[PDB]
Design an enzyme around this catalytic site. Structure first.
Site, PDB file in Angstrom:
ATOM      1  N   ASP A 113       0.817  -1.206   0.000  1.00 57.74           N
ATOM      2  CA  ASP A 113       0.000   0.000   0.000  1.00 57.74           C
ATOM      3  C   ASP A 113       0.855   1.261   0.000  1.00 57.74           C
ATOM      4  O   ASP A 113       1.753   1.423   0.827  1.00 57.74           O
ATOM      5  CB  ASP A 113      -0.927  -0.006   1.219  1.00 57.74           C
ATOM      6  CG  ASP A 113      -2.040   1.024   1.120  1.00 57.74           C
ATOM      7  OD1 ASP A 113      -2.871   1.077   2.047  1.00 57.74           O
ATOM      8  OD2 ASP A 113      -2.090   1.776   0.125  1.00 57.74           O
ATOM      9  N   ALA A 160     -11.470   5.254   2.486  1.00 63.37           N
ATOM     10  CA  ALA A 160     -12.884   4.900   2.486  1.00 63.37           C
ATOM     11  C   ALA A 160     -13.474   4.316   3.766  1.00 63.37           C
ATOM     12  O   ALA A 160     -14.559   3.738   3.724  1.00 63.37           O
ATOM     13  CB  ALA A 160     -13.163   3.943   1.326  1.00 63.37           C
TER      14      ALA A 160
END
Ligand SMILES: [Co+2]
Ligand SMILES: [Co+2]
Ligand SMILES: [Co+2]
Ligand code: NA
Ligand code: NA
Ligand SMILES: [Y+3]
Lengths: 305, 299
Positions: B80, B204
């Site tokens: 990530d 999110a």
């Protein structure tokens, strides 16, 4: 690299030093133990109890075994206090190189039977085993000439036990608050008894329930908001002599838990806005590593790799 | 089973559901995510930032990769927010099957060149990659830096990247926006129309009020926190979002549980006793997120 518990413990007793068997339950603890071992250029035993096997599962056993192989010091993966034959099979399945079956709370005959079966299974797959006798059995009809002499390990019986089970190393009752002796007297070490046992049993000896629990550590825990009894632990000098007498494996768990928990408390008490685990688990892992490095120093395993 | 991020994301966009990329940094977070996936019989992505890489090291990457192979659901191990070519090479070295090269803070040509170099290296070893075009920032106050549909198409064609993170209103952290953060679903539909590769949604997490409440109640301190609304995630997914990143939600849950535990039991120093329930809370969050993303029974 990964090796049997005996390869490590035999060399240790031969050369007069102790190896710490540090209990781990997750990544941070395992990292702390191995880094300490590397920095101290010391062999080390990774101990996983059945509680660890359940809590850590495949993730833990995967780490313990694979990381042990990559270490630059000898490492053994040991099942701490197994309670059944199946538990031992599970440990053999998970790649452990040392297993311990605890049936000391059973009569001498059953303890022998249970242990012997674990020994046969472990040896069939190249794994060494730790057995445990912690109370006068009365086998050779020895009579307890004292209250303590009753709940502690009889030299002669230990020799017989090891002769019958074929175990590789033995945990003995010599004063630490553990087993029958538990909650029955102040924590101490019966060096005289230890010497007698060591004289009849050349196999490396194991010491259970003996953490230092230094004052500074307990202080820090209490200061962090923790509560604990008047915890009493074996004195440093006694551990040093016990080792000189034949103790090659020293189980260590409590001291790591206390240090780990103390720092998490300090971090959360001081940084209420902190919700990034690494910020509070990180220093806790470091505190654990420090305890381990000190134990290795006390045990005399520095540079023994 | 361990598979590439694209094998999972292409299927997800094709079928209309989203797969979560959950950030993990240690054993219990990793166990929580994988158990949630198995119980939900859902595909999942294990996300490891460079920070997780530094903190977890070899132990973490070992667990992520090896446990993924044993999972009975499709799993991808994803780097990530990789910040460099060499960070990506280390992830490739660590057996990752998905990597994100993040250069959205650089100009178009630079983002293209660097992303393209990553793509060539990753594709040479069967690893798929995520790139990011646009800058994540709050909306409601077109935008100075939201993702442009046509540029997005150009970007993917020129880089050869496998999935794209798009800027349509979200941002990382517990403080998305004043009240419900606005999501440019119109802009997302336009991007999805020109960019067929699966789309990625960063920052999110939901940051639910009750979770914030539970954190505060344990002594934690947090300001006016707000995350992306569940309804916006559902719609974003239907429009093309296949990868939804979640991190903050897991961290708040974990920390809250640890606090309550140490608050209630000052005599407890067995880590399994306060870490275990925290791990359980993380697992529950992951499972509900999979419910929301529509990935249940998708494995
Ligand atoms: Co014992
Ligand atoms: Co992002
Ligand atoms: Co992100
Ligand atoms: Na043991
Ligand atoms: Na990403
Ligand atoms: Y970025």
């Amino acid at each position: 690299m990964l090796v049997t518990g005996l390869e490590i413990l035999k060399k240790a007793r031969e050369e007069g030093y102790g190896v710490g068997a540090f209990n781990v339950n997750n990544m941070e603890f395992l990292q702390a133990v191995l880094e300490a071992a590397e920095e101290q250029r010391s062999p080390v035993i990774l101990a996983l109890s059945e509680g660890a096997m359940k809590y850590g599962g495949r993730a833990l056993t995967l780490m313990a075994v694979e990381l042990a192989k990559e270490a630059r010091v000898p490492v053994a993966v040991h099942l701490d206090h197994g309670s059944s034959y199946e538990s031992v099979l599970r440990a053999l399945r998970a790649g452990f190189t040392s297993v311990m079956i605890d049936k000391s709370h059973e009569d001498f005959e059953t303890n022998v039977r249970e242990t012997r079966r674990v020994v046969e299974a472990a040896h069939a797959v190249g794994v060494t085993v730790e057995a445990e006798l912690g109370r006068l059995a009365g086998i050779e009809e020895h009579v307890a000439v004292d209250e303590k002499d009753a709940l502690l390990t009889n030299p002669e019986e230990a020799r017989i036990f090891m002769e019958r089970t074929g175990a590789d190393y033995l945990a003995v009752a010599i004063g630490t608050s553990h087993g029958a002796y538990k909650g029955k007297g102040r924590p101490f070490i019966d060096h005289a008894r230890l010497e007698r046992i060591a004289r009849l049993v050349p196999a490396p000896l194991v010491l259970h329930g003996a953490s230092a629990v230094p004052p500074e550590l307990v202080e820090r825990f209490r200061a962090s908001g923790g509560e604990i009894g008047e915890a009493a632990g074996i004195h440093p000098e006694d551990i040093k002599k016990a080792i000189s007498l034949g103790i090659a494996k020293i189980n260590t768990d409590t001291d790591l838990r206390l240090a780990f928990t103390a720092l998490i408390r300090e971090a959360l008490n001081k940084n209420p806005k902190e919700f990034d685990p690494r910020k509070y688990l990180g220093p806790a892992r470091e505190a654990v590593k420090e305890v381990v490095k000190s134990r290795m120093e006390l045990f005399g395993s520095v540079g023994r790799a």
